[PDB]
Design a protein around this ligand. Structure first.
Ligand SMILES: CC(C)c1cc(C(=O)N2CCc3ccccc3C2)c(O)cc1O
Ligand SMILES: CC(C)c1cc(C(=O)N2CCc3ccccc3C2)c(O)cc1O
Lengths: 207, 207
């Protein structure tokens, strides 16, 4: 288990998300699904010119898995996945994101729902989750587990639990008062409201 | 001068944009600026780990250049730019875009303003332009000019006019009835309405 610090501005953004009063939390799901879609776009695109990249799974889809007993909502995709390095650079640093622009926007009148415009939508997970686990598998690396309850750090370790094939799985350990998002009709409502046009099957599992 | 065919679905999307009655054309600028921003994000990001990528220009900005005499609106950025190959793959084929999802969305109630959600916002240029020229320079290639008046094809050639350094320049040869978008106050209005939060300076040139 390796423990890393978030880049300062990331930590600041996370704090903002966790601490700002903002009721319209449901947008977290849209942003996660949107990331999934992007990742699926990427493998689809690369696999045009190299079909062997599908050897780890041809089906391109997104699964939504609620679990009331564990109080978790899991979003799984069969997208391109992330290597260890992608994982650490993309989740722990500003990278190609508009972290700064977002935080500045928030001061100039913008609202949190616009987070996706700035390439940092993943962190909206922290509107509803006390902890977030990201399990990922890229064709070019082994399976890794990223994890963070915020507070300025995250961990990365190899994951030898259930091999995934290829893709990314985001496990949301929900806050106590956010169990709303484990309810079939609530989830259905949100997907219809915000993600009806996504170009990949979205399957909502039942319990 | 090499002449290429658009991938069928691209050609179909372009036709849709050109032929669909849709008054809210001003969104074209938002989408172009958004592409610019993304491209600037990318060079910013790569230049963290390799500062020599800025040798071709350290300033990261977007310029808006109207020209009433030529009836053109030009959008210039100092982003990462595109190689010849990126140019041909990214503008001529579906690539990583949601072209299909967009066109399907349009049938299921979506509207053209949502084009950006599907990674094909560039083509909104054809709401206002009869022709679009894209001049680009990536650190890893020479300067190239892409061009298309739609109708199913585009051309690519080396550009030895004015070297750019690094970046992408989108020249919009406006349709006769769209000279609206050469007016300083109109442009100002649109940038404020749709692109106020972009994280790079946007400079509007005067004539
Ligand atoms: C944890 C967040 C950030 C996240 C990342 C991915 C992912 O694997 N990439 C892989 C690389 C890539 C390439 C293009 C577009 C998006 C992505 C995201 C995903 O599928 C879902 C997610 O919710
Ligand atoms: C003609 C359209 C498509 C377009 C492309 C670019 C561009 O150079 N890339 C370069 C590669 C890249 C990488 C990440 C995000 C966007 C972009 C767009 C741009 O700066 C502006 C544009 O309006």
């Amino acid at each position: 288990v390796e423990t890393f610090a978030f880049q300062a501005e990331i930590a600041q953004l996370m704090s903002l998300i966790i601490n700002t009063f903002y009721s319209n939390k449901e947008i977290f799901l849209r942003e996660l699904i949107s990331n999934s879609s992007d990742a699926l776009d990427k493998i689809r695109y690369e696999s045009l010119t190299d079909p062997s990249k599908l050897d780890s799974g041809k089906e391109l889809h997104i699964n939504l898995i609620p679990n009331k007993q564990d109080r978790t909502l899991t979003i799984v995709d069969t997208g391109i996945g992330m290597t260890k390095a992608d994982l650490i650079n993309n989740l722990g640093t500003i990278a190609k994101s508009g972290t700064k622009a977002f935080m500045e926007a928030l001061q100039a009148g913008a609202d949190i729902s616009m987070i996706g415009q700035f390439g940092v939508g993943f962190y909206s997970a922290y509107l509803v989750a006390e902890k977030v686990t990201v399990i990922t598998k890229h064709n070019d690396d082994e399976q890794y587990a990223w994890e963070s309850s915020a507070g300025g750090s995250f961990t990365v370790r190899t994951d030898t639990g259930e091999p995934m094939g290829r893709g990314t799985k985001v496990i949301l350990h929900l806050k106590e008062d956010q169990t709303e998002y484990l309810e079939e009709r609530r989830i259905k409502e949100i997907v219809k409201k915000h993600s009806q046009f996504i170009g990949y099957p979205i399957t909502l599992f039942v319990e």
